[PDB]
Design a binder for this molecule. Structure first.
Ligand SMILES: N[C@@H](Cc1c[nH]c2ccccc12)C(=O)O
Ligand SMILES: [Zn+2]
Length: 432
């Protein structure tokens, strides 16, 4: 019934394909966890579904409709189960509307320093929900194998403002409440939905032209940022140019960061990375932008494969550094030095504690480094382009990566990657 994730075996619904979330979120007091929601999901199915089973953790559903009609539904501790009048069958779509309100719950953190979900701090409420926190404030198929598009209408006090992933279109004001509308038009995982409410400023920059593609530029600055918390002019443009030349077209219509005066890790929310000021460094800004491809466009089939996101986004930092004239092998050697004094593992994680560990970042990055040195920069660059296209609209797995390497780069290239993917001991440092 669930997706059957190796790490989180209860999340999601098997065969469920949510294509679009139309969310109206109302935050009465930014900084306080209470909220209310009105969401319509446009859902498809990959296998016949007699029910729609969504993840929800905290708020209480008060009403549900299926294609405009009253429908039978029950809410458990962590699920909303909607009995459909008839099975939803592949090729068909329906619209599930849920009315809900209450207090989002944070998913317990046994792996990361973040308890993921709806965060409340310093007059700010915002999503920091990787891996399974989005269900706290949004009834969702909470699994990266099912990305979707989002249209979000956020209602906040007039004194406040809001920013969500996607292009900002309208703001209206009535009875002391503002409503802002954002349109995420390319599909991303549930946790990649950025959503921040409170005292925030929108700042635009000139468009970035990437040969037959225009990328809009805007950052968000919340109040109370430390002195010197900035995105310096033109850096995002040069990063977009270097990364897209390596990976292919930037998958979204806008990019920027939302700089927050809190102390947490950066999260790669789509087209608008949620960036605590503590993490606002050049390498982290590159890292988060690389995730727009690897993580947000290319999504995981299973949470055990986080290195396909974290390792790829980490290696992009080395590709960027070399683009700025730096010595990439030295950076690779530094990564290796840091891993050499830590326990190592195969890249496919077996436990939740591992999915964001040092192996996922740096052993994954060095896995790509081994492959690149084996096949050369030209072949490696064409593989990255082929990889992104192969796994757009189809979730990626470690096995599928190795199969792709075998057909595209050959059996020797595949076994080079396999030494780094499999095997408990950390292999020697990859060298030219
Ligand atoms: N994906 C994040 C790590 C991360 C996992 N879960 C999170 C929750 C909140 C913020 C960050 C995270 C990164 O790029 O390093
Ligand atoms: Zn990352």
């Amino acid at each position: 019934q669930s997706v059957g994730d190796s790490i989180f075996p209860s999340l999601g619904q098997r065969g469920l394909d949510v294509q679009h979330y139309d969310l109206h979120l109302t935050v009465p007091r930014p900084g306080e966890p209470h909220l209310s929601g009105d969401v319509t999901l446009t859902v498809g199915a990959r296998e016949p579904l007699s029910r729609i089973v969504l993840d929800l953790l905290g708020p209480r559903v008060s009403a549900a409709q299926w294609n405009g009609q009253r429908v039978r539904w029950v809410q458990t501790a962590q699920k909303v189960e909607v009995t459909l009048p008839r099975p939803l069958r592949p090729g068909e779509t329906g619209r599930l509307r849920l009315i809900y309100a209450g207090t989002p719950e944070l998913s317990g953190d046994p792996g990361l320093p973040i308890r993921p979900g709806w965060q409340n701090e310093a007059g700010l409420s915002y999503s920091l929900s990787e891996p399974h926190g989005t269900r706290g404030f949004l009834p969702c198929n909470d699994h990266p194998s099912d990305p979707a598009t989002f249209t979000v209408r956020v209602t906040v006090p007039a004194s406040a403002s809001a920013a969500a992933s996607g292009l900002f279109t309208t703001q209206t004001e009535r009875n002391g409440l503002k409503t802002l509308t954002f349109t995420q038009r390319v599909p991303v995982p549930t946790y990649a939905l950025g959503l921040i409410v409170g005292p925030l400023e929108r700042r635009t920059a000139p468009d970035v032209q990437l040969g037959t593609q225009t990328v809009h530029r805007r950052d968000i600055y919340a109040a109370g940022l430390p002195a010197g918390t900035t995105v310096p002019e033109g850096e995002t443009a040069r990063m977009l140019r270097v990364l897209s030349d390596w990976f292919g077209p930037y998958p979204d219509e806008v990019y920027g960061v939302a700089l927050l005066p809190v102390r947490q890790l950066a999260l790669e929310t789509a087209g608008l990375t949620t960036m605590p000021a503590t993490s606002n460094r050049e390498r982290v800004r590159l890292h988060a932008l690389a995730h727009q491809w690897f993580g947000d466009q290319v999504t995981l089939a299973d949470w055990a494969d986080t290195w396909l996101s974290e390792g790829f986004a980490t290696y992009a930092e080395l590709l960027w550094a070399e683009s700025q004239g730096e010595d990439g092998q030295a950076m690779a050697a530094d990564w290796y030095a840091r891993l050499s004094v830590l326990p190592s593992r195969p890249l496919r994680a077996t436990r939740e504690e591992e999915i964001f560990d040092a192996s996922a970042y740096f052993r994954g990055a060095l896995a790509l480094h081994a492959l690149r040195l084996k096949v050369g920069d030209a072949a490696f660059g064409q593989f990255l382009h082929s990889y992104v296209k192969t796994f757009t609209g189809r979730p990626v797995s470690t096995t599928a990566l190795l199969t792709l390497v075998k057909t595209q780069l050959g059996a020797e290239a595949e076994q080079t990657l396999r030494v780094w993917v499999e095997g408990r001991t950390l292999p020697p440092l990859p060298e030219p």
